Amino acid sequence: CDAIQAAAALGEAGISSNEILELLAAAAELGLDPDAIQAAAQLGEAGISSEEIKELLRAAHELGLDPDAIAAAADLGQAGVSPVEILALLIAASVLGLDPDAIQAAAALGEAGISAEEIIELLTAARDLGLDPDAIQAAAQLGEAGISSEEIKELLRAAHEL
Amino acid sequence: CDAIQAAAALGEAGISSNEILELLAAAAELGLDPDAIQAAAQLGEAGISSEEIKELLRAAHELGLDPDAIAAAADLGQAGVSPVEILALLIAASVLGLDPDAIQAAAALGEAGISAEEIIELLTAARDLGLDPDAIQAAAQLGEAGISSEEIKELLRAAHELGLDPDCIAAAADLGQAGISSSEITALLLAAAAIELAKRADDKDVREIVRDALELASRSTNDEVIRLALEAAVLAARSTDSDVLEIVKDALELAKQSTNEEVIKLALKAAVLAAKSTDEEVLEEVKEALRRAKESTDEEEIKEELRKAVEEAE
Amino acid sequence: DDLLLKLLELLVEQARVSAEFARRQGDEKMLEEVARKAEEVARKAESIARKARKEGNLELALKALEILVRAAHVLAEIARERGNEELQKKAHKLAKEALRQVIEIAIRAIQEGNLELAIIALHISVRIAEVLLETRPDDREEIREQQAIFELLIAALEAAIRLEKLKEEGAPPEQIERVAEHGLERLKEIAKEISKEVDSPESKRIAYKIVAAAAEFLLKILAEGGATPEQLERVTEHALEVLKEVAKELADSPESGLAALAAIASLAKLGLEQLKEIGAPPEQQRRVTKAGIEAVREIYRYGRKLY
Hints:
part of a larger assembly, 3 chains, A: 162 residues, mainly alpha, 10 helices, C: mainly alpha, 11 helices, de novo protein
């Protein structure tokens, strides 16, 4: 039954019949799993267009993103991140070799409203400083505290130098 | 002690002492148990007349109804169904040989307000299709989704042809509550089932066929081509035969190449009939007919070769 | 929709003029082309007809059925010139389905009370008879069954229009009683006579449902006439009594039992709704309910001769 229940979720998200059939054409071509399809449904509920979701799914496959990175695409989508910036954030983390926890902390920086280039420089700094993903989680918490990216970088620099 | 509680319940329903004694006289003659009498008290609380309950008791004995079949009358009565309509459902359920679960599903169709003839024809359809009570419960859910009774018959006939589980019929009721049309629900059942099968058997040829069918269906403005292509995808996703895979892939490729809806329907219908069928000589002649078509100098020869194959296989 | 339906008419007429060309000069490829084109018309019309059935527009459904008969006429002539079995087999199958569909629509048209649609449906049924009569060199029993259903529907319509005339004239309830009473008598006698010659189970099921719909129409006319609860009682009892003895003639199986039950008890339920609407006193409500239950009792105990 589960695939028909996923189609019912896409119907509750207001996706039209030919758009579901095209998303199912992508699911058959790309070999999409239930949690990747659930992330596509959640990108639909976040209001991302069907045509963009088809590019997001194409990109996730052509990148070779894992299912938890695909789930993080829907988290960045519910955070309101622009569709190509979702792909940049995921691509950057993946090409840096960062893990799903570091990607989830990047989604938390997105929920904190941090600019995408500032997230990427923060991820680059944490990677070059050799820090654990909790440093990215602390950067999100410092963002919620209203600390500037320069001052987060100063605090991390001081913590590393000391 | 506890036998007095029936008299207390009937007194609380406003039934007079001579009527309680008369109902007790009938219940004693018929030998009916305290919970069958409690169902009579619930019918009295539902406002059913004492003199009608005497017929309900008599009928239950003359049919030899079990206590749960008797209890279902109280649920129908609280649903507002008449004593006579209760007698229809029970008298029919008896000759149909229905179990208490199917009778409770008939009580649920009563709570859905479905007409008794439509309930009995739906029960006859489920009986003739050899279905389990879960199909009747799912038909009640399609009634709660507001689907018309012969569209329930279409969805049942489809689910029976397609070997679907009852939870797919529950998901069809969810799509009905979402406002999707019965033909589009059928397309979604077909496509989702083909991909659920492809997740169990992820063969490159299955993935290519299912994709090409979903693409052709997404391209098509005609829903007969959709239902043909997505049923071919379900048949190919259940199949383990290289000839069915080749015939369906050739038909989908020819249908993705061609611009004529008639040649498209001929090629897909020939492939569907070949995939329903089980004869290696028919499969060989169909593969030959697809060669004759792909190598043809004339589209009228494509039409007549495919017609001869279709009209031999149908 | 009607514009598409008329395109089918034009297509059919061009094919029919081409069927004159097939007599005047002749060609197998022309005959093949008009046969295929007529099947494409038939599929177009069938597609509209299924949609019209689901939407409940009887006028479009009857128009589409008449076009299916127009297509069947040219198909039958094309098959006759070609000496062809496949087209005659297609024609018989399509006509037999059309007969069932137009019967169900005619039952519905009598049930909703638009007798002009029923008259049009019977006109189409005569045209289906014209097709069937051309189609079979051999079978009499199909013609007997169709004509029996037609004779029944006609007799029911003759009663229906006699009652509708009394209703239009504002006739007194006593005339409406004696006309309805003899209407049920004539229905019973005709059903009894027809039951000697018919044997298709589906036809018997149809015929019973027609008698039931005729009783339903009589009851609803009496209700539109605002008759007394004494008249509602007398006529309902006589009607259920007739419909019960007609069940004892026609019923032979669980399938027919289910129909007899559903119809009789629906008619009684509808009768009780008239008692509810007029506000009849509790003893009338009991009397009608008893008559209905005693019919259900007799239907069970008749059925228990077989089950």
